[PDB]
Amino acid sequence: LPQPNSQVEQILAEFQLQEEDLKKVMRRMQKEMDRGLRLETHEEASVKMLPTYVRSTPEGSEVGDFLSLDLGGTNFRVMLVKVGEWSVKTKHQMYSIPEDAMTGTAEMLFDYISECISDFLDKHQMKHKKLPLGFTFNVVGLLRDAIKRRGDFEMDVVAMVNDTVATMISCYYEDHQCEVGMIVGTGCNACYMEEMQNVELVEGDEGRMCVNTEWGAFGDSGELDEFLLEYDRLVDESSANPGQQLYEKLIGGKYMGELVRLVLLRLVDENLLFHGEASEQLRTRGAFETRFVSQVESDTGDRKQIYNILSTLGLRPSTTDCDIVRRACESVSTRAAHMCSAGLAGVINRMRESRVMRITVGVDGSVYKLHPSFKERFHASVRRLTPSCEITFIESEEGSGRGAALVSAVACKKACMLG
Numbered sequence: 001l002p003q004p005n006s007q008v009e010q011i012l013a014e015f016q017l018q019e020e021d022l023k024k025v026m027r028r029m030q031k032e033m034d035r036g037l038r039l040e041t042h043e044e045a046s047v048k049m050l051p052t053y054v055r056s057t058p059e060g061s062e063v064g065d066f067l068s069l070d071l072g073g074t075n076f077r078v079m080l081v082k083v084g085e086w087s088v089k090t091k092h093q094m095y096s097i098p099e100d101a102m103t104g105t106a107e108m109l110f111d112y113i114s115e116c117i118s119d120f121l122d123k124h125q126m127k128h129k130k131l132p133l134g135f136t137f138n139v140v141g142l143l144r145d146a147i148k149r150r151g152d153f154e155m156d157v158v159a160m161v162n163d164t165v166a167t168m169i170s171c172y173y174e175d176h177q178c179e180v181g182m183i184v185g186t187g188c189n190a191c192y193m194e195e196m197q198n199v200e201l202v203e204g205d206e207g208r209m210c211v212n213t214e215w216g217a218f219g220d221s222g223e224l225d226e227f228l229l230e231y232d233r234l235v236d237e238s239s240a241n242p243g244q245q246l247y248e249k250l251i252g253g254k255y256m257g258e259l260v261r262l263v264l265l266r267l268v269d270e271n272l273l274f275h276g277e278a279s280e281q282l283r284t285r286g287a288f289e290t291r292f293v294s295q296v297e298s299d300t301g302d303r304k305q306i307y308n309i310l311s312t313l314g315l316r317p318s319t320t321d322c323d324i325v326r327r328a329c330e331s332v333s334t335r336a337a338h339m340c341s342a343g344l345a346g347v348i349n350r351m352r353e354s355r356v357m358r359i360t361v362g363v364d365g366s367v368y369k370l371h372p373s374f375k376e377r378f379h380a381s382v383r384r385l386t387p388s389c390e391i392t393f394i395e396s397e398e399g400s401g402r403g404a405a406l407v408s409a410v411a412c413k414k415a416c417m418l419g
């Protein structure tokens, strides 16, 4: 790599977060999680720490057979599942959606889906049962409505679990040390197994329960204020919910490309990029897509991806411009990974207080899966902040559908247990 421009690096260095800063943030996140878990402060807590009612032990044993419905792009999988003593038995059918039903109203699509479910129930002689059904990936309402509209067979569509909870469970299927689920995509959230005695919103002492942190809300009371840059404040001011979800705004894919756009305009204004002239597309809110960040960071060193991204924005960038854009993208990404690791570090250090603790964390989301070096920087930062823990990270892939089927089993059992 070459000798970097000194004035560009001075602007990009603002994004740096040292260990001490991350320790502060992590420590602040832990206080906020404490507030969320306690009865007396839960209603006022910004970080809600929602009990999911997903317990460490088996419940809802009166659930044998259920349907799992995997909703994909242009098709869907209908699956019959039997849980035994657990022994997950499955059989399934892939259906392709006609363009006829793809291009109609949402009602006509779910009419089609119900028809397919009916066919599947006929094939396996199950139409007398009345099974619970869970979704995997107001589709619920659409399906409830479409089933009622049919009125031949009877079915119970259950409430979905949160996506962090689905992530943790499907990963749990492949690794029983998985006790944390995390999403870094358009938003950012995490769930983990908490001791029952810490979950004050549910009476009970024994075992563990999954808690949905909903930690994106963090920042409400100023916990992030000293870490916010001019670009962050601009993104906040122009958002749908200014002053809310400040943690998520520092991390999620929703605002990542926009932060980069603002860093590039700052550099143009300093006459350090594009000769002090920005295009109209670059001055357009939303024009720099988050997907562009990961494309720019994928570049092998030839600058063809960066040049081709920047050319779609009416810019004619020299090789130096391209290198600057790479570095602007890297600073934003790296900061997101640092902020995210402080949240996860807080959770893992808290769990450790009740147990080398060996733990698996299940992770999903476009930012985490698709961004070139994000997961790596994120891993190294989390591990740095979690002494006396050995952390394994896995992405759910479940190449047979059984992790997905377990997600539906748990959701159906919980719906039953809750009435």
Ligand SMILES: O=C(Nc1ncc(F)s1)[C@H](CC1CCOCC1)n1ncc2c(S(=O)(=O)C3CC3)cccc21
Residues within 6 Å of the ligand: 053, 054, 055, 056, 057, 058, 059, 060, 086, 168, 169, 172, 173, 178, 179, 193, 410, 412, 413, 414, 415, 417
């Ligand atoms: O069913 C569960 N919880 C519920 N809460 C409320 C309901 F209505 S249901 C738990 C959930 C897991 C989630 C991840 O953290 C650990 C617990 N659950 N799910 C599979 C499983 C197995 S298993 O036999 O499936 C295992 C070999 C694969 C044994 C023991 C408890 C098991």
Ligand SMILES: OC[C@H]1O[C@H](O)[C@H](O)[C@@H](O)[C@@H]1O
Residues within 6 Å of the ligand: 162, 163, 164, 183, 185, 186, 187, 188, 189, 214, 216, 248
């Ligand atoms: O999709 C990841 C997360 O995004 C947002 O933070 C949602 O509030 C949360 O419910 C979800 O888990």
